């Protein structure tokens, strides 16, 4: 209701096409999804 305190999920027109996603990542994703598997819990 108030000034900005509510997340008005409004599509922002100039804020729309700022930066293209740049996948700068060094590993092969299998290392890390096994890693997130056997983190502290496993």
């Amino acid at each position: 209701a108030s000034k900005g305190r509510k997340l008005r999920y409004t599509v922002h027109e100039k804020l729309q096409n700022f930066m293209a996603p740049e996948d700068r990542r060094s590993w092969e994703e299998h290392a890390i999804d096994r890693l997130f598997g056997t983190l502290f819990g496993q």
Binding site: K3, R5, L7, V11, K14, F18, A20, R25, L39
Partner: protein, 382 residues
């Protein structure tokens, strides 16, 4: 240009000589009315207007390394320099004292900053791309480059839904607030305002890597690090019960060993799967460490430790030995290094931003070649 220590000499080429300087108007008055004989040779500048007339908040050098963007306090603004040409490229102003910024592009063409008046403001060399007012107050910032999305910790509890605490997030190819990443801070007073309470209710630090995996590491004011994973949109880990508010959060060059630190001044180096600390150091006094990042001489690895008591200690990691320590004579709000080598830049509470050179760690950078000859001139002096 002086040197603080004996064995491993640091070299403050520039900075405030006096912790309590006079008013600059009276200073120039006494200058223009008084006869004085200063050391014209060894006292100099590298770069034009390396000050902010009250203090500064945050500095970064670009991925191209050619731009020095520094956010400063009085009539709040930001100085951007081309360090290739050793001068201000320009100096553009804002509406309140900035908290912290980040550069999107490899050059200065795209900047964003969290600003104290609940805002996230964007900047091109043309001018200002319009700011976004976040709902609740925040501390720090991180950027998902692989899928361009700014994320920001928030203090206090959420209004509806759960009572965890949140990390606001907005994608750059989408334009919307996607969803606040709910990170549990703890309990708060039910009879209060919507901004939370003073005693607790804060998520403080967030760290990520952008060459390795880059897990979303979060740090909150009960001394707790949490973890989220990109492409999962979900929490991964809750770990690290400590006493102080966790202020440091930084991945190493491998992407595995984490080096966090708590506001008691207690630094801990962890392995991502060993819950036991790889290393612990409780140093200085209780006045909180602010910034800790890894840094490498061309052979070895070492670590920064910046505590706001004018304490900047470079420690070793492989041995844990305190390699060096400097007293920058003033309170300081930000520390960087040159990723090339050599220089350690520090935005301060003082008038002039203060910077340092170390020869035993690295060389004079690619835009100041003769600084090696300057420290050689100091070597001829002593």
């Amino acid at each position: 240009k002086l040197t603080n220590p004996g064995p491993v000499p640091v070299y403050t080429v520039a900075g405030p000589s006096t912790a309590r300087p006079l008013p600059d108007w009276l200073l120039r008055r006494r200058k223009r009315s008084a006869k004085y004989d200063p050391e014209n040779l060894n006292n100099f500048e590298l770069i034009q207007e390396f000050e902010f007339e009250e203090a500064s908040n945050c500095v970064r050098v670009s991925e191209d390394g050619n731009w020095i963007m520094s956010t400063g306090t009085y009539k709040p603004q930001f100085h951007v320099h081309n360090t290739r040409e050793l001068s201000l490229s320009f100096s553009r102003h804002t509406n309140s004292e900035n908290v912290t910024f980040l550069l999107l592009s490899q050059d200065y063409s795209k900047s964003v900053h969290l600003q104290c008046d609940r805002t996230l403001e964007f900047h091109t060399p043309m001018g200002c791309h319009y700011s976004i007012r976040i709902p609740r107050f925040g501390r720090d910032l991180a950027y998902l480059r692989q899928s361009c999305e700014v994320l920001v910790p928030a203090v206090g509890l959420s209004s509806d839904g759960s009572g965890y605490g949140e990390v606001f997030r907005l994608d750059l190819e989408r334009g919307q607030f996607l969803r606040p990443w709910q990170v549990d801070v703890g309990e708060d007073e039910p009879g209060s305002g919507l901004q939370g309470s003073i005693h607790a209710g804060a998520v403080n630090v967030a760290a990520v890597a952008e060459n390795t995996h880059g897990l979303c590491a979060f740090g909150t004011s009960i001394g707790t690090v949490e973890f989220y994973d990109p492409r999962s949109k979900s929490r991964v880990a809750v770990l690290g019960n400590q006493d102080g508010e966790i202020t440091a959060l930084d991945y190493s060059r491998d992407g595995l060993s984490l080096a966090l630190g708590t506001s008691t001044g207690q630094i801990r180096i962890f392995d991502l799967r060993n819950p036991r600390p790889l290393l612990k150091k409780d140093q200085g006094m209780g006045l909180p460490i602010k910034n800790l990042i890894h840094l490498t001489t061309p052979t070895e690895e070492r670590k920064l430790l910046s505590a706001d008591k004018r304490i900047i200690k470079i420690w070793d990691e492989q041995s844990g030995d305190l390699w060096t320590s400097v007293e920058p004579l003033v309170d300081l709000n930000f520390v960087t290094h040159v990723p090339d080598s050599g220089m350690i830049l520090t935005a301060n509470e003082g008038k002039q931003m203060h910077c340092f050179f170390i020869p035993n760690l690295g060389l004079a950078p690619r835009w100041c070649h003769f600084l090696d000859n300057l420290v050689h001139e100091m070597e001829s002096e002593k």
